[PDB]
Amino acid sequence: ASATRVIQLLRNWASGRDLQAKLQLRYQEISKRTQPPPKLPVGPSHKLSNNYYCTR
């Protein structure tokens, strides 16, 4: 975050752990709100030849 180092030390002593390692707030490690397009594969029964429906 942006907390003062003395406040950071106070938080670490009060909680007993190192809060700077794991923060509940998300800052920049999340995925981008815009993503490249996908391709989404088809499936097993998209064959043209050995795909008579009465066998599946």
Add this chain to the structure above:
Amino acid sequence: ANVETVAVSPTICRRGGAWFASFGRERNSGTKLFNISGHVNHPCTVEEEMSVPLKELIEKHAGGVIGGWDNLLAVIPGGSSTPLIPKSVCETVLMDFDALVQAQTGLGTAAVIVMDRSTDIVKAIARLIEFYKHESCGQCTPCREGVDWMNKVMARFVKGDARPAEIDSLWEISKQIEGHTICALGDGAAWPVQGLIRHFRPELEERMQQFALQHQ
């Protein structure tokens, strides 16, 4: 009855059935009229015994294949409705019903279309399928739709504008026409496609590869 069947009848009655049965193999008796056309030196209509070998007939009456017997690529022995056979089969095949049925073709009407190695075999079979497309009466669904479907697929195959998987699908399409129609025009349209797929699949696959690499 066919004109030949009725025409040979008075001679059969006069000379007897035994004389007619003297010629040809068993259950394939008598003489037959052969129309040899295509890539032969002397295309012609001739009369010959039933079980004459194909090679002997071609070299004797038709003058041989254009460019020698080693130039032969394929033969359609019974008109457009019979599947083609490659050179390795036209070496020791007899021109009767049973011998040609054994080679998976059938004698049909004894019309020998000869093609040498200077031909685009896929184009010839596509032209035959287009003929069957233009001569469909359009009554029953299998012929009416599937023959046009096969014509489109073959026309696209000539350019190599498909993928190898389609080959198998085309085969199955033929199986959905043959045996499901009113008359035998559906069977006669499905059979040449099956013969081509059976005997010249590497040619189709190579053409598709060439088109794929040329067009990226």
